[PDB]
Write a protein that binds this ligand. Structure first.
Ligand code: HEM
Length: 152
């Protein structure tokens, strides 16, 4: 898994997100939707967002960004002992939302991008390495549950 030092870096980076969780969450989703428009189609309630300006102006998009990053933050704070938090999310995303594991890769990449965009020069090589490992662990544990379910 991750070392104690690596987890410390992850949670330090997470403090930066927590200062503006809605702002980070909004930017993560906009990065996801604009880079991969197929992802928007998974959200009946964001389908109407035909432009990035409309996305930016959407308070509901921001609200969902908050929900998403709040859940992720909870999982990260468990430092890999996250089965109870992660299993239900994996199951909802496979069975109800029908989100392929590829889209979780896309959103992981979007998180890394947004961290660099909002914290340029303040999200160093060590920090990126640690956050990347944590998001890979998250994705991998979801993928294990997806396999159980035969999803995708
Ligand atoms: C960091 C990764 C993600 C986290 C932590 C996360 C978390 C959540 C949470 C907590 C909910 C509400 C509870 C639930 O339905 O399980 C939710 C809903 C949902 N998620 Fe995710 N999610 C992630 C990635 C994604 C991705 C990549 C997609 C699609 C590309 C997606 C699609 C959806 C949809 C369609 C809903 C229902 C939205 C609604 O209509 O209210 N999620 N997510």
């Amino acid at each position: 898994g991750l070392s104690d030092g690596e987890w410390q870096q992850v949670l330090n980076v997470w403090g930066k997100v927590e200062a503006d969780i809605a702002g980070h969450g909004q930017e993560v989703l906009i990065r996801l939707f604009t880079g991969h428009p197929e992802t928007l189609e998974k959200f009946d309630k964001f389908k109407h967002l035909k432009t990035e300006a409309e996305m930016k102006a959407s308070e509901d998009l921001k609200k969902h960004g908050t929900v998403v990053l709040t859940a992720l933050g909870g999982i990260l704070k468990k430092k890999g002992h996250h089965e109870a938090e992660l299993k239900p999310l994996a199951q909802s995303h496979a069975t109800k939302h029908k989100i392929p594991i590829k889209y979780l890769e896309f959103i992981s990449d979007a998180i890394i991008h947004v961290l660099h965009s909002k914290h340029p020069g303040d999200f160093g090589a060590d920090a990126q390495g640690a956050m990347t490992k944590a998001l890979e662990l998250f994705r991998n544990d979801i993928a294990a549950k997806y396999k159980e379910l035969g999803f995708q």
